Amino acid sequence: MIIPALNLIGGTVVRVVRLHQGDYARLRDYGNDPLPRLQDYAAQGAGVLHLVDLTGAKDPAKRQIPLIKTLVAGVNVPVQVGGGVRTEEDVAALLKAGVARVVIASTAVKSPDVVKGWFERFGAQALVLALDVRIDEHGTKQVAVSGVSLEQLVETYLPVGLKHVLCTDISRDGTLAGSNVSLYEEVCARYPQIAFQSSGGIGDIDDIAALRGTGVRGVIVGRALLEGKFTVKEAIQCWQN
């Protein structure tokens, strides 16, 4: 499936650029209109929607639960949400607000003992392991936010039933240069029991086509949709052919 993505800061749909320390900088504001954007995405056939709560990421005390509740209610397609999910209570709050899947990167690589417990409480279908991948000079898929590889972390969670992984090539985020096809070809084949979502870099319709047959189950598209490189409708018809 095609998975359209929005970044949210205090109710605003934003463009950000990832910085060194896991930090980032706000580039563009697209508007204060997340719900109509999501409804248009759904109307065009998007089967899943992706939201990153950057406000909650900075400060979990400020998680945008009331907004998320409204956004989930206002469409009839499942929404997955990430952003500074740190505790079992955070996961529960998001599911209670009507989120279909909770997306977790930082806490999952930092505190595997804790997050394993979440798998056992909520079940594997409720949780998406998000991997912020940096390929180093040696070819290692680094995912720390000492080092941790993609493979090491996937293996960490397979025993508690890991099924969904969002694999972001963070150097590709917002570049419009294409997603990392070879990376997805490799990891999808290595873990055929896992449903990988690709993320970062989609630039034009050819880039969607290029991920067909890689094994990727979901293609996250952010910037290209926001800046009208193509519509959700045509992304879907490319992806489904």
Ligand X SMILES: NC(=O)c1ncn([C@@H]2O[C@H](COP(=O)(O)O)[C@@H](O)[C@H]2O)c1N/C=N\CC(=O)[C@H](O)[C@H](O)COP(=O)(O)O
Of 42, 91, 130, 133, the one binding ligand X (CB under 6 A) is 130
C-alpha span between 4 and 43 (Å, rounded): 12
Our CB check for Na ion shows the closer of 13 and 236 to be 236
Q: 127: which strand partners?
A: 102
Binding of residue 201 to ligand X (CB under 6 A): yes
> Could you give the CA distance from residue 120 to residue 127 in angstroms, rounded to a whole number?
11
Task: Work out whether 223 is an interface residue with ligand X (CB under 6 A).
Answer: yes
Residue placing its CB nearer to ligand X in the complex, 24 or 30: 24
N-to-C CA span, the chain: 11
State the Cα–Cα distance between residues 241 and 235, nearest whole angstrom: 10
Does 181 engage in binding with ligand X (CB under 6 A)?
A: no
Q: Restricting to residues 56-85, which ones interact with ligand X according to CB under 6 A?
A: 57, 82-85
Paired residues of 13 in beta bridges: 8, 31
Rounded distance between C-alpha atoms, residue 199 and residue 38, angstroms: 18
169 binds, among ligand X, Na ion, none (CB under 5 to 8 A by kind): none
Is 24 one of the binding residues for ligand X (CB under 6 A)? Answer: yes
Burial class (CB in 10 A: 0-12, 13-18, 19+), 175: middle
Beta bridge partners of residue 131, listed in sequence order: 167
Q: Which partner in ligand X, Na ion, none is near 223 (CB below 5 to 8 A by kind)?
A: ligand X
State yes or no: residue 215 binds ligand X (CB under 6 A): no
Which option in Na ion, ligand X, none does residue 84 bind, with CB closer than 5 to 8 A by kind?
Answer: ligand X
Residues engaged in binding ligand X (CB under 6 A): 5, 7, 16, 18, 24, 52, 57, 82-85, 103-106, 130, 132, 166, 168, 173-174, 199-202, 220-224
